[PDB]
Amino acid sequence: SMDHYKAKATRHIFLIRASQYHVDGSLEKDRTLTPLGREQAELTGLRLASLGLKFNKIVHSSMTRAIETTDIISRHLPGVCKVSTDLLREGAPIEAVQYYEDGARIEAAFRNYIHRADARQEEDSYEIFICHANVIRYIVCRALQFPPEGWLRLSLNNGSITHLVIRPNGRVALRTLGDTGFMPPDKITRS
Amino acid sequence: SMDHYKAKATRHIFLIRASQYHVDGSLEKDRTLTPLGREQAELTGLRLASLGLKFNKIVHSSMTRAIETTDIISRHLPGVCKVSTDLLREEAVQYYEDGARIEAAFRNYIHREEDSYEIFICHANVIRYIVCRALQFPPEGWLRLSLNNGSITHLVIRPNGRVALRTLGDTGFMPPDKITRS
Ligand code: NA
Ligand code: NA
Ligand code: NA
Ligand code: NA
Ligand code: NA
Ligand code: NA
């Protein structure tokens, strides 16, 4: 749960891990989704669209694989706006200064997108964030007040859905973590 | 990682919450699955059978709704043996002892030569406790987990006691209109 938090209605947070991609791509432009990663993103988009929810926005990491995952998912959610942010780019694997910078940035993402209540909120909101494993691990453990040793104990599949429910007073519930039950087992990967 | 733990191979633990049931049943024999609860259990059994795994055993709570959830899931898993236990069943002295029983379940089934795949069909408070205990999360954390009826929660315990949570509360294989929390 979160301290010093007061929102006007309940917020549903859907954290999506980017789909399978070309890890060995030389440049960032080369680190595109694999054919299977594209199929994974289609399955996640189908599932999100079947929920019968009006999503307020899709916020996504600016990494190539997150942009491409977002593009595919967004096809299933016509009219939902998309916002790119460098704050949700992946953090270094769990050089000291790079880790300092990543920790500060992902904390800023948590504060800006998760802990921040929108004074303009007028009804329950449903928000999609398409990003990366370490970012999602950090956000989940911070929101639930789990220790940082918890990050590596969460093992998230490509394209998986993690669903947090934030009540107006800051109580946070974990409804699902790493959900890929909507994918056939022969399409499920971790990298 | 879990302390004082040394296994010979990796253990996959699938924790299944019982399906929707008649909460207002007067006696325990009356607290049976609803028609939708039976459909949920069928969906979970279909999913478990599709994973390409040979399950070593199904351990289940002796509560009526867990027995009936197990009966349906087991139809999809021929040859997998079933074990009933009171340890997994869901004033002040009775509540303390119920809590002590859940810690005993954790010690007996979780903390205790080839990789194994084990199914445990039980209840929300038991599963949430086990998840937070295995992941070494604070004791207050359990109530922050919200599990759907018939959901699959998947823990992996490595031989050195390292634990990973692969999924929690998965009902992605159910159509949205079949999903319930009570
Ligand atoms: Na990329
Ligand atoms: Na809220
Ligand atoms: Na996962
Ligand atoms: Na029952
Ligand atoms: Na759930
Ligand atoms: Na359900």
Residue numbers in the entry:
A (entry chain A): 88 to 181, 193 to 289
B (entry chain B): 88 to 177, 193 to 214, 220 to 289
Authors' account:
Phosphoglycerate mutase family member 5 (PGAM5) is an atypical protein phosphatase implicated in a number of functions within mitochondria, including organelle homeostasis, mitophagy, and cell death. Between the MTS and phosphatase domain, PGAM5 contains a linker domain with a centrally located “multimerization motif” that potentiates PGAM5 activity.
Chaikuad et al. suggested that capping of the active site by the β3–α3 loop positions active-site residues in the catalytically competent state. However, a crystal structure of Δ90 PGAM5 H105A without the MM that we determined suggests otherwise. Although the crystal packing is identical in the two Δ90 PGAM5 structures, the active-site residues of Δ90 PGAM5 H105A adopt catalytically competent conformations (PO4 “on”) in the presence of a phosphate ion. The main difference between this dimer conformation and the apo “on” state of the dodecameric ∆90 PGAM5 H105A/MM structure is a disordered β3–α3 loop in Δ90 PGAM5 H105A. Altogether, these structures point to a remarkable plasticity of the PGAM5 catalytic center, which indicates that multiple structural elements coordinate for catalysis.
